[PDB]
Amino acid sequence: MVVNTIYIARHGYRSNWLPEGPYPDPLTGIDSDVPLAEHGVQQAKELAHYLLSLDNQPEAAFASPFYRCLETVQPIAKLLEIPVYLERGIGEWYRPDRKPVIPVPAGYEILSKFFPGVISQEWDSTLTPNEKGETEQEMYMRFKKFWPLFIERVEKEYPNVECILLVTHAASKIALGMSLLGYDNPRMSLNENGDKIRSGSCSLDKYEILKKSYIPFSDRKWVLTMNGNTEFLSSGEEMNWNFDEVETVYISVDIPSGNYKERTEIAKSAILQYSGLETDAPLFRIGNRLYEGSWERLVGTELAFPNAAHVHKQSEKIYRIKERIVLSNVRPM
Amino acid sequence: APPLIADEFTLDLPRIPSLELPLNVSTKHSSIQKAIKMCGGIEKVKEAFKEHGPIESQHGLQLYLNDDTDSDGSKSYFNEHPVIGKRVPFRDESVILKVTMPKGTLSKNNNSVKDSIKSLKDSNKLRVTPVSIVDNTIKFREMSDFQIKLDNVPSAREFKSSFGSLEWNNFKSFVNSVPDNDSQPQENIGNLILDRSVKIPSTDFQLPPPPKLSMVGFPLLYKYKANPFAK
Amino acid sequence: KTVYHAGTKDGVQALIRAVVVTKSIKNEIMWDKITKLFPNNSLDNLKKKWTARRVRMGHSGWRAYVDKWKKMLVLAIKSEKISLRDVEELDLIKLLDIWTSFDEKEIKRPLFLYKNYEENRKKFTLVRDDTLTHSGNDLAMSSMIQREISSLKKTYTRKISASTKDLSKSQSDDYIRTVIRSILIESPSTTRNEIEALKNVGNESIDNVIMDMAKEKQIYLHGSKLECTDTLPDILENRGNYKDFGVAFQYRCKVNELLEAGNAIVINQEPSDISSWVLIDLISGELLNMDVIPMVRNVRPLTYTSRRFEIRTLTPPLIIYANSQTKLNTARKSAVKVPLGKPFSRLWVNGSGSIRPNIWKQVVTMVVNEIIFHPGITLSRLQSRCREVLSLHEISEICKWLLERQVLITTDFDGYWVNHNWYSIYEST
Amino acid sequence: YEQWFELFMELSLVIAKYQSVEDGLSVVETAQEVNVFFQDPERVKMMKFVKLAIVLQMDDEEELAENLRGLLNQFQFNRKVLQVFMYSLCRGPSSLNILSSTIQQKFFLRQLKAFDSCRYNTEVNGQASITNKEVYNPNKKSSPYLYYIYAVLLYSSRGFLSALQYLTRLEEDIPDDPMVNLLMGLSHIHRAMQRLTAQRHFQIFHGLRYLYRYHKIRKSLYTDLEKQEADYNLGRAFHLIGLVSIAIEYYNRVLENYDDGKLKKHAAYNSIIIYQQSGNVELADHLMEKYLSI
DNA sequence: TTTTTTTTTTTTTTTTTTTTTTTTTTTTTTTTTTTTTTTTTTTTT
DNA sequence: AAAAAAAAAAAAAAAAAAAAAAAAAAAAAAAAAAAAAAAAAAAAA
């Protein structure tokens, strides 16, 4: 099989971000390599309950061998019933002037004592990043080199993989994304309007194939059809980092069936685009179906509940969806 | 230059229940959390989505229109036979678009999400993602039942100030003044009542209502027409 | 020289493309040009197939074909595939091959949106597929599974914007449907081009609404003739109710004159169905208290029975009479001039500008027969529940004429509801 | 130990006002086993009453039916006992099943048989046995407090003609009480609407004698702030039997004529829920804000 | 230049799919039948 | 003429039948595919 889905997520909230101690000792004995806070483990459980709701479960999770990226997947792996594979090709980024040392983490033999039953020794790492640190030019080319070698091994070792998860560090999240999409450098905006890969703790990327009708790695093309998602986290975007006030509302996209006994539905793993939200009638796609719909406000006030989503193996977060669009079916020609 | 492609987004998303309360709640969490407290609270709102089965075997979700409390901490209208909502069987699927945009764009634009968007038309600050799919809904379309009031019928105030309040101090004096040997089951319960402060008429035997004064909560269809099925 | 037999699966699409190309260029269906492409078929077989295809696609299809055609025509001139001379001579072969060649290239693209909205308005043309027709019906329901499944699903919203149709333009579209209905009860058939009153409204919209009314079976189409469907009269005689109210202003008299005597009408047999359209309202008007004929009964110890226990004595035959305290339902109605628009403006009004009085009776009573069971109504959900019968331009002239004759009263936001003795529309004086 | 009894009952009533109501039950049903409380029978009566109040803050059919059968049995024939049963079954349609059940309608026939046995001093076929023996009735009237709840357990269960039996039996004895005349009118109309009955229009109007008798009783012999429910309920009736514009004049009377907000939220809701079907969607959202929003 | 053969196009026939109507099954209501008790009539002393 | 026994009716209770609504099956209509026939093109004499 050929991988249709790549997820990339940054690790949970670091213990050494906390305002007061005692800051915990790095369990591996290596410099940096700190564990998560309980608040970070909570963002990891949120991320897990988001992915768990998607019919597109991961087949496996590739973890950075740095301690905090594995402490991020220990609830995910045990909740989606998947193996975790160590991959040095998705470790942290450090520069050659970083002090007092460049951290590179210990092997399966140490990590399996802290994360028993989570990690599988079945996979050998695609590549190791430079132990003397990497320039931005080295770092970007190391990730550009990783992708074809990595996916070529995945589709030979694990030919049943159509969906995969990668859990890693801030530079390691953005640099992987920009190189998969095929940009010249990690500082480029995704579009002319200036958007970039959003990269707070537990922020989620999904990269999805353009669909035909085995395939080599070089002929493939993608879209980042879920940018740095935090809409499932309690606290939203936190401790974001990037290569260099706001208010929230919700609109329902209703798709009504004509006969009251007949129900109409949204296809698994389908895609949406919106255009002309500002206009008296926007345009929409759902899978390969197209639409246009009137602007509507309710009598009364729908609540719709993310915290009450289905499972398909503080103020409670709730949406007051008083405003809506009612999509008439509006196919192309 | 190749015309710019709109960001494609997944529709594999968390799938979401929804609740069309005929309550015109404000944007504030302070309005929302009490508008939920009316329909049996954050617990029963979730459980009423799990209730599968044919539409007449559904208990449905209870909506209490008067969360009003008297100073004793009673339900001020403990006589409230609630509104019933039931889970729609034929809910079409629907996707929710979160709009992220500059603070106070709402107050600047008629408090309309539509015109809030239309104000930022030329600008990089507008940010839309589809974020979840509603696949299931409850609608409150079964009426509140008949409702008595128990503030002028004396033993009804005895019940409210005792049962409704749970106040031991105003409950002991309902139950004491209950006969063991009911001396005269023929006669007006007023004969046991200390409290004459409400001028109850002599003919009132202070019968309470049943919990369903109506038996069927949708209208029973007595459109008046001559029954062709009466035979 | 691309030719088709109209029986070929592509030949039906070639016939569609060719009428769109000819009418969009020369403002007319050039049949003398189209028949050159279908030598294997007769003029009238081709007309019929074309008419049936415009009926099934309706308003939301025809303009989508014309808009894609003119957008493809603009793209073909800008890519030198078409000289303006090929447009002026109307060479259907070239224009059909060019349409075929454009679809052959778009078929190869997975159909993504541009971010730019005008690029989407250029490079899609769009057919609105009428599943939810906005005919607000829940058809002839009686069962509690029918009624609770319907009324859990049904929509509870208000439009924020004007509709995607300009409401100043829709104020001609609904007014077309009504001028048509208001002539289908007048006549078993009518001709679009010659005899329609609407023609100040653009003939294109007249024709598009004729296609939509045939799609919704409000008319049959026999070529140029729209044809009357008795389904409209049948829905008036099933949902209109005026004979019950008629005998109800008459049963008001039969109750009232007897009330002050005390010893009055006795209810001792099944009283008429209409008698319950009157007694229930007049008792709810606090005119009434009810006395008992004291039928002596064999109550005995050890006995616990109901169903025929002294038979009639558990509906012990009542005397129905004046309560001493009150009368509420007196002299409230008045000679309010009938709601009468332009010569077929509203379902009832006849060509002379007076009511078709039976259609008026049936339709006002139909609207009150909505509102008895539908108080606090907009003009809009009454337009959708009446979409098989009345537009919004009709429903205001009933609902305000019933507020002025006080059978209706209105809340905030022009919700209509009836105050008591509502059935008595047709009172004796 | 009256001090400890007071502390147990007050503590249970306090616990039941908040979360984990089951801890309140544990105190009272422990007190029903403790001889120090349960050998005083007024306190037996009080415990069974307290736990019945507490049950209505939680929500069930079976626990509530069990506590009620637990205190109509003791404290036999008794007006206040029978009346607290009928307040209790108000909130929750979970409560309707306790009255549609045959299991309780059998109980109320056997009680009516037992009262007749002690009224005429005979055996009665399938009576309950008497144990509360000061029951004295020299003018030999019925017990209205029996007649009514036996009609209720026939009225719930859709025995509408069988319910009208015992409310015509209570009409003979206490002619102008409120709930007798409301429930009786309720039985005649709920009966009437069954698929096929002979005398169907006749069978609705007997509903109106006993509803409007209850209204003329309430409107002319009670305080304004409780005439409001005479307007609300007669409104509600017309809505139940689907004569809804007659329900609306009466719902509006709750909104316009009175100060006390409580019934305006019901009259408003049962207006809104019509006004959705009717589709004055503007007015519905407006009333909803004016009365129901916060 | 003419005749024969092969290929392509058009028309007709057959089969499958969708829509509509009828029949069967289940549920609710109403009427009738069965059983028990009381009253009236007939037979016997 | 009186008293006792038996039969019938009535009130009541319980069960069965009748009526309506819902679901499934059969029939009818429409669309698609296959087969046959005719026309056109190519090759051979």
Numbering used by the authors:
A (entry chain D): 1 to 213, 228 to 258, 290 to 358, 416 to 435
B (entry chain C): 21 to 251
C (entry chain A): 732 to 1160
D (entry chain B): 732 to 1025
Original paper wording:
Transcription of transfer RNA (tRNA) genes by RNA polymerase (Pol) III requires the general transcription factor IIIC (TFIIIC), which recognizes intragenic A-box and B-box DNA motifs of type II gene promoters. To adapt to these naturally varying distances, TFIIIC interacts with the A-box and B-box through its two subcomplexes, τA and τB, respectively, which are connected by a flexible linker.
Separate cryo-EM reconstructions of the τB and τA subcomplexes were achieved at 2.46 and 3.65 Å resolution, respectively. The τA map exhibited considerable anisotropy, but this did not impede the overall interpretation of the τA structure and its interaction with DNA. In yeast τA, four domains interact with the tRNAHis gene: the helical domain (aa 732–838) and WH6 (aa 972–1053) in τ138, TPR15 in τ131 (aa 908–953) and the DNA-interacting loop (aa 247–251) in τ95 (bottom). Although several τA domains are involved, each domain establishes only a relatively small interface, mostly via electrostatic interactions with the DNA phosphate backbone. This binding mode may account for the weak DNA-binding affinity of τA, potentially becoming stabilized by additional factors such as TFIIIB. While the relatively low resolution of DNA in the τA subcomplex did not allow us to assign a more precise register of DNA sequence recognition, we observed a pronounced overall DNA curvature suggesting DNA shape recognition. In the τA–type II promoter complex, the tRNAHis gene spans the τA subcomplex, crossing the helical domain at its most downstream point and extending directly to the WH6 domain of τ138 at its most upstream region. Consistent with this hypothesis, our τA–DNA cryo-EM structure reveals bent DNA in the upstream region, as well as in the 2D classes.
